[PDB]
Amino acid sequence: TFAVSVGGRRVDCEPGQTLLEAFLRGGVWMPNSCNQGTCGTCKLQVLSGEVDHGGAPEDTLSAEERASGLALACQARPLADTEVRSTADAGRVTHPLRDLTATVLEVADIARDTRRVLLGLAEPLAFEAGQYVELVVPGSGARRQYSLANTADEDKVLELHVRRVPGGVATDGWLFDGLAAGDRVEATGPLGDFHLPPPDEDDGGPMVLIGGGTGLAPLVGIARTALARHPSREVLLYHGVRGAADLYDLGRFAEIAEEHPGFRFVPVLSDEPDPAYRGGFPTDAFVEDVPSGRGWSGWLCGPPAMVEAGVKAFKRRRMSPRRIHREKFTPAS
Ligand SMILES: Cc1cc2nc3c(=O)[nH]c(=O)nc-3n(C[C@H](O)[C@H](O)[C@H](O)COP(=O)(O)OP(=O)(O)OC[C@H]3O[C@@H](n4cnc5c(N)ncnc54)[C@H](O)[C@@H]3O)c2cc1C
Ligand code: FES
Ligand SMILES: [Br-]
Ligand code: NA
């Protein structure tokens, strides 16, 4: 193994192991949001040593950047003892990344092309609401990310919301065709940075959360966590789907709203109109409801283009860049 360090903290990395996984398995945090080379948030400066850049794509890590000594922690494997620089906060404690002993407790068809998967764990998992877990497709080897809908106290049964992708390896080929209660599932977690700041740094200000499709999943955990901390706070949760057939858990959100007068749940249908529901695209509905985003925080999760367009729309209505949070469901193939 090689010694790899960030922020004064050392871990030992096996030669076939990536920098990111070595650090998180040691409880040493650095930014990460996909573990597959697409989000670019794990970019590092190599200060000393040497890495193999692995499968790092050019659009995430250019030849120019490699020549200047940058790398992606989730793609880089050490070829010598290596010292790296991440962000200022890298090196702080985080929940350790670990291998899970996970068993399917339930798989339920909950909406058009949508399944809930409940995974029971042998041991409690420490995580922040909004983090995700990485599943391995049995027999295939493909790795795919699924956000937790859980609050952190729901630490023994992981809740996933899975959207069927036609022709998809993990969804069409397994989670929608074959997965059954009692199956063991290869999984590691937690991963990801899409979560609330520590309670001490949470001013209780208003939040808008926008989920495209099953991008709703981490927002369920984040919204419930935020409301537990500040029960009267304003939390606007928009669910952007094609039609009413895509909606789910309406009763659960209604119970949240009855308890929390600042909470609202707003379906937004883009393709199949329904008189009961707002039409259009979900970021558009928030802008209509809240014409000025100044002083708001915003949480966007879903397909990458939806997130990126939503971020820009938030900023044009003067929401502060510092308070905009993103989780992109970027395809792995
Ligand atoms: C951090 C992160 C968190 C995620 N959390 C969730 C979650 O909570 N719930 C969830 O359902 N998914 C989530 N995803 C997306 C998920 O990991 C898979 O990519 C998705 O389920 C499709 O995988 P697949 O193997 O079925 O399709 P693949 O076999 O990888 O793709 C099949 C084909 O369809 C294309 N494709 C892939 N995705 C889409 C898509 N949405 N729409 C249209 N075409 C597509 C692919 O490019 C490919 O050509 C997350 C992704 C990331 C990076
Ligand atoms: S590019 Fe490395 S975690 Fe996303
Ligand atoms: Br476990
Ligand atoms: Na990193």
Author numbering: 2 to 334
Which text from the study accompanies this structure?
As reported in a companion study, we isolated a cytochrome P450-reductase gene pair, gcoAB, from Amycolatopsis sp. ATCC 39116 (encoding proteins with accession numbers WP_020419855.1 and WP_020419854.1). Unlike other known tetrahydrofolate- or non-heme iron-dependent demethylases, which are fairly substrate specific, the P450-reductase pair characterized here (GcoAB) demethylates diverse aromatic substrates, potentially providing an important advantage in both natural and biotechnological contexts. GcoA and GcoB operate as a multi-domain complex; guaiacol is processed exclusively in GcoA, with electrons supplied by the GcoB redox machinery. While the organization of P450 systems is diverse, the architecture of this 2-protein system, combining a catalytic P450 with a 2Fe-2S ferredoxin domain in addition to FAD and NAD binding sites, represents a new class.
Analysis of the GcoB sequence, however, suggests it contains all of the necessary domains in a single polypeptide, with an N-terminal 2Fe-2S ferredoxin domain followed by an FAD and NAD(P) binding region with homology to ferredoxin-NADPH reductase (FNR) type oxido-reductases. Structurally, the compact, N-terminal 2Fe-2S domain of GcoB bears strong homology to putidaredoxin (Pdx), a ferredoxin that transfers electrons to P450cam in the three-component camphor hydroxylase system from P. putida. The C-terminal region consists of an FAD-binding domain, containing 6 beta-strands and a single alpha helix, followed by an NADH-binding domain. A structural comparison of the NADH-binding domain with the NADPH binding domain from a related CPR is strongly predictive of a binding preference for NADH over NADPH. While the individual domains are structurally similar to other CPR proteins, the overall domain architecture is not, and instead it is highly conserved with reductase proteins such as BenC27, the benzoate 1,2-dioxygenase reductase from A. baylyi ADP1, which supplies electrons to Rieske-type aromatic ring-hydroxylating dioxygenases. This suggests an unexpected convergence in the organization of the reductase partners for these evolutionarily distinct oxyenases. GcoB has an absorbance maximum at 454 nm, indicative of oxidized FAD, and peaks at 423 nm and 480 nm most likely due to the 2Fe-2S cluster. In agreement with our comparative structural analysis, the reaction with NADH was over 50-fold faster than with NADPH (kcat = 44 ± 1 s−1, KM = 16 ± 0.2 μM, 25 °C, pH 7.5; all activity measurements referenced per active cofactor). Finally, distinct from most P450 systems, the GcoB reductase is encoded as a single polypeptide rather than two.
